[PDB]
């Protein structure tokens, strides 16, 4: 996350931190995700496409730090890793950038809500907030595009929904932006998602409800003018979510 503020998991308790175990037993961060029901985390297929084997992944809920443990976290294996059979990415855009992870603890259990862990609601079909609505994004992604290190503490920021009209302008994204996407950005272009934030939530209040409107998917650079963050548009993926879940 570029700009924004350090936070804690209690303020974003549906956030999931997803890691990959390596050949030697080292473990590195992969991407974010969001807890949509006790046994299910939703994320982005691009995060997993190169290494699609469920057994390598670890999911933490209730975790506020990247490389250190925090009080109230819970650790899960991945029982099912469901990628979108239609994922494609041209040079910039990723299409059908959505993934599901069925989580299970080594004692065979799913998540339990707590001070640090809660589910986030999905939007009803095709139901998105009005353009200009202020939403939140969160993640362990880079604080500057040019950085090589990741922040150790979770970060969040606020961005506003932009219309497809606005987002489709040749000086924005053009048709690179399909109706299965959503654009969001800072009116001043100072804060944005970045590498490592993919898979994480775009959360909006929609008809009284904290809702997973989007999933961090792609964009040109990070926090560049006329280059919003693009999100997988969750309102347009319910049937896929229901059938796989």
């Amino acid at each position: 996350i570029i700009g924004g503020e350090f936070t804690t998991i209690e303020n974003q308790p549906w956030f999931a931190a997803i890691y990959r175990r390596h050949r030697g037993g080292s473990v590195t961060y992969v991407c974010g995700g969001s807890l949509i029901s006790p046994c299910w985390v939703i994320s982005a297929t691009h995060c997993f496409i190169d290494y699609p084997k469920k057994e390598d992944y670890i999911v933490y809920l209730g975790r506020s730090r990247l490389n250190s443990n925090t009080q109230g976290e819970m650790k899960f294996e991945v029982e099912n890793l469901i990628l979108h059979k239609d994922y494609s990415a041209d040079t910039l855009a990723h299409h059908n950038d959505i993934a599901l992870l069925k989580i299970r603890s080594k004692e065979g259990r799913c998540a339990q809500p707590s001070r640090t862990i809660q589910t986030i609601a999905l939007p009803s079909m095709y139901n998105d907030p009005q353009f200009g609505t202020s939403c939140e994004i969160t993640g362990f992604g880079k604080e500057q595009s040019t950085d090589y290190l990741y922040p150790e503490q979770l970060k969040m920021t606020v961005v506003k929904l932009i219309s497809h009209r606005e987002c489709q302008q040749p000086h924005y994204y053009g048709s690179e932006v399909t109706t299965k996407m959503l654009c969001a950005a800072d009116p001043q272009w100072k804060t944005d998602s970045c590498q490592g934030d993919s898979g994480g939530p775009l959360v909006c209040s929609l008809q009284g409800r904290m809702t997973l409107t989007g999933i961090v998917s792609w964009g040109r650079g990070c926090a560049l003018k006329d280059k919003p963050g693009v999100y997988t548009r969750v309102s347009h993926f319910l049937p896929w979510i229901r059938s796989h879940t």
């Binding site: 992969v30 691009h46 992604g141 970045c194 993919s198 964009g219 990070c222």
Partner: peptide
């Protein structure tokens, strides 16, 4: 380059392409 330990290797910002 970019190795197998890379975070979010296909994310925005990444040297992937």
């Amino acid at each position: 380059a970019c190795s197998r330990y890379e975070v979010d290797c296909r994310g925005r910002x990444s040297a992937c392409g």
